[PDB]
Amino acid sequence: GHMPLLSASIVSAPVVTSETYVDIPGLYLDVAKAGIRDGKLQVILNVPTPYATGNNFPGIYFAIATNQGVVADGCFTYSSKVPESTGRMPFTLVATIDVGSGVTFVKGQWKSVRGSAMHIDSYASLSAIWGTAA
Amino acid sequence: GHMPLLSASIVSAPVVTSETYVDIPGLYLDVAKAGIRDGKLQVILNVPTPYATGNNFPGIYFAIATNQGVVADGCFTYSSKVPESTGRMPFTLVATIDVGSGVTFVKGQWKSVRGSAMHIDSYASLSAIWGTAA
Amino acid sequence: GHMPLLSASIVSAPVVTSETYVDIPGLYLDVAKAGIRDGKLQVILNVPTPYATGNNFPGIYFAIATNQGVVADGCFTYSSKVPESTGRMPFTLVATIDVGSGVTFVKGQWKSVRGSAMHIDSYASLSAIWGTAA
Ligand SMILES: CC(=O)N[C@H]1[C@H](O[C@@H]2[C@@H](O)[C@H](O)O[C@H](CO)[C@@H]2O)O[C@H](CO)[C@@H](O[C@@H]2O[C@H](CO)[C@H](O)[C@H](O)[C@H]2O[C@@H]2O[C@@H](C)[C@@H](O)[C@@H](O)[C@@H]2O)[C@@H]1O[C@@H]1O[C@@H](C)[C@@H](O)[C@@H](O)[C@@H]1O
Ligand SMILES: CC(=O)N[C@H]1[C@H](O[C@@H]2[C@@H](O)[C@H](O)O[C@H](CO)[C@@H]2O)O[C@H](CO)[C@@H](O[C@@H]2O[C@H](CO)[C@H](O)[C@H](O)[C@H]2O[C@@H]2O[C@@H](C)[C@@H](O)[C@@H](O)[C@@H]2O)[C@@H]1O[C@@H]1O[C@@H](C)[C@@H](O)[C@@H](O)[C@@H]1O
Ligand SMILES: CC(=O)N[C@H]1[C@H](O[C@@H]2[C@@H](O)[C@H](O)O[C@H](CO)[C@@H]2O)O[C@H](CO)[C@@H](O[C@@H]2O[C@H](CO)[C@H](O)[C@H](O)[C@H]2O[C@@H]2O[C@@H](C)[C@@H](O)[C@@H](O)[C@@H]2O)[C@@H]1O[C@@H]1O[C@@H](C)[C@@H](O)[C@@H](O)[C@@H]1O
């Protein structure tokens, strides 16, 4: 384990609405367990096939979070107030975290855009590659 | 070659329809040749500018596949049955594979959503970073 | 610094139009400074929440560029000539570069699709992982 790669994957999540970032169940990396105590992690949240349902330009915010909270966030939104059929909108988020700050874990989170119901019904991943500062 | 990075890129592919996952020609990493026999690979399939044509909510499924078959898959779809003009829908898929299972290669694949013709006419990549278990 | 991870992030950029690739201010990795003189870099440009405004199927081209120019590029475009409201269209681009060619830096760049104004008003990143040839 000189060069550890962390990964977690899901294929579904209970459909929820949330005004605040809530964990995506199963997208969680236990960093402490891996013996990562310092250095840097490049974390990728990959949700390649999500959709959102709602009545007001639906979408989903996603975030990468540690113990210390959200490090990076982003969203997709549809370009129609009520899309003919809510299409799949691939989403990727990349963030680099300093593990020494007190990071024990990394997780993926999501939140509604304008009261959207959030849908994962296929593969989604959270991955991390360990490195050093330059 | 202590820390090998694998990469393959294309700029086009013959436009095809397929009911089943078929290789995207040229998105192929010969892992065995690189002397990767165990450990983990973080594989990224990046198709940043695809489009699909069809008459029924067109889209494309994409997959990361090894010798042992599809490890991860996802899709984009338009939100209109027949879009005014089929726009570019960036797509990224990330998967982590155990090389020891008998992985000699990693490839990108695609399949039609609802009989869509699949279009790559610009840069697309398949990349991999080698690591260990934690 | 045996295994260096490079990263840069922004949360906004002045809104501009450009017929040619122009730097996205702040998405810049000083590679030379990190003492990377050879080997390979896997570079990810992550713009998870952009939008474009215009009157003719708006969109944005993005590129990864070194001192030696653009190594990889891609775009998103809307599927309507004038979208009801220009939605957020997550964009990721992945490229692997040979550092020995005279690479001192890596940057993210963008260009208008059909005279689109280019909008970043939230987190965007440029990341790189160092490896060797196989
Ligand atoms: C209630 C309903 O029928 N929804 C369908 C959807 O119906 C379309 C209408 O809403 C539209 O305005 O009129 C057209 C006329 O053609 C449609 O009848 O059709 C989509 C497919 O276009 C369908 O979703 C597919 O469902 C199948 C199983 O039947 C698959 O699981 C397939 O992957 C689904 O398509 C994807 O998911 C949807 C949300 C979009 O993102 C597509 O672009 C993807 O390809 C709708 O079906 C519903 O949603 C499904 C996920 C499922 O939960 C069904 O139980 C539900 O009816
Ligand atoms: C048959 C045709 O003319 N298709 C065009 C498309 O026409 C539009 C109509 O379908 C629409 O409903 O009405 C409007 C009125 O303005 C249009 O006339 O226009 C697009 C550009 O908007 C055009 O695609 C561009 O073609 C050029 C070369 O002319 C470039 O290669 C450019 O990158 C193309 O745009 C992209 O690709 C298309 C598919 C979309 O994803 C855009 O959002 C991208 O920016 C259509 O042209 C066709 O498709 C091209 C790929 C090419 O194969 C042409 O030979 C073909 O006419
Ligand atoms: C001028 C204007 O009002 N633009 C709004 C937009 O208005 C819609 C109309 O253009 C449409 O055709 O009719 C509907 C009727 O409901 C709307 O009134 O609404 C969007 C939200 O739907 C709004 O953008 C949001 O603005 C807030 C602050 O008020 C937030 O910053 C929010 O994140 C914005 O939404 C996102 O950004 C826009 C561009 C889209 O990508 C959405 O899908 C995202 O969720 C428009 O507001 C404008 O753009 C904002 C970025 C901001 O600069 C405002 O000052 C400007 O009015």
| Tokens found for residue C86 | 């220009």
Among the partner residues B77, B96, B130, nearest to A127 by beta-carbon distance? B96
Name residues whose C-beta falls within 8 Å of residue A7's C-beta, 6 or more positions apart in sequence: A29, A125, A126, A127, A128, B40, B42, B95, B96
Give the residues across from C32 on adjacent strands.
none
Residues of chain B with C-beta less than 8 angstroms from the C-beta of A122: 73-75
Nearest CA in chain B to A34: B134
- Which among B33, B79, B89 has the least Cβ separation from residue C76? B89
Smallest CA separation from ligand 3 atom 12, residue:
C84
Helix, strand, or coil (residue C39): coil
> How far apart are the CA of B29 and the nearest CA of chain C, in angstroms?
11
CA–CA distance, A30 with B114 (Å, rounded to integer):
39
Task: Find out whether the beta carbon of B113 lies less than 6 Å from any atom of ligand 1.
Answer: yes
Give me the phi and psi of B61, to 5 degrees please: -85, 145
Query: How far apart (Å, rounded) are the C-alpha atoms in residues B93 and B75?
Result: 9
For residue B17, with 0-12 CB atoms within 10 Å meaning exposed, 13-18 middle and 19 or more buried, which class applies? middle
Q: Do C96 and B125 touch (CB under 8 A)?
A: yes
Rounded Cα distance between C28 and B104, Å, is: 36
Q: Where are the domains of chain A?
A: 4-132
User: A22 near A118, Cβ under 8 Å?
Assistant: no
- Any ligand 1 atom below 6 A from CB of A78: no
Chain A residues contacting C via beta carbons under 8 Å: 3, 39-42, 44, 57, 59, 62, 72-81, 89-96, 129-134
C83/chain B closest Cα distance in angstroms: 10
* d(C-alpha A65, C-alpha A62), whole Å: 10
Q: Cα(B62)–Cα(B112) distance, rounded to whole angstroms?
A: 9
CB atoms C122 and A73 under 8 Å: yes
Question: Do the strands C5-10 and C124-131 form a parallel or antiparallel pair, or are they unpaired?
Answer: antiparallel
The number of the ligand nearest the C-alpha atom of B77 reads: 1
Query: After which residues are there C–N gaps above 2.5 Å in chain C?
Result: none
- What whole-number distance in Å separates Cα of residue B97 and Cα of residue A9? 12
CB B7 within 8 A of CB B21: no
Three-state SS across chain A?
CCCEEEEEEECCCCCECCCCCEEEEEEEEECHHHCCCCCEEEEEEEECCCEEECCCCCEEEEEEEECCEEEEEEEEECCCCCCCCCCCCCEEEEEEEEHHHCCCEEEEEEEEECCCEEECCCCEEEEEEEEECC
Cα separation, B89 vs B84, in Å, equals 14
Per DSSP bridges, beta strands A124-131 and A5-10 are antiparallel
Q: How long a stretch of residues is chain B?
A: 134
Top mutation candidate among B19, B56, B57 for ligand 1, by most atoms within 8 Å of CB: B57
Residues with Cβ within 8 Å of residue B32, at least 6 apart in sequence: B104, B105
User: Of C56, C47, C126, which is closest to residue C86 (Cα–Cα)?
Assistant: C56
- Cβ neighbours of residue C69 closer than 8 Å, sequence gap 6 or more: none
Residue C17 to residue C118: CA distance in whole angstroms: 6
- Alpha-carbon distance C52 to C43, whole Å? 24
For B113, residues 6+ apart whose C-beta sits below 8 A from its C-beta are B52, B54, B57, B58, B59, B60, B61, B75, B77
Contact between B106 and B97 (Cβ < 8 Å) = yes
Full DSSP string of B113-131: ETTPEEE--S-EEEEEEEE
* Way the structure was solved: X-ray
Half-sphere exposure of B105 (CA within 13 A, CB side): 12
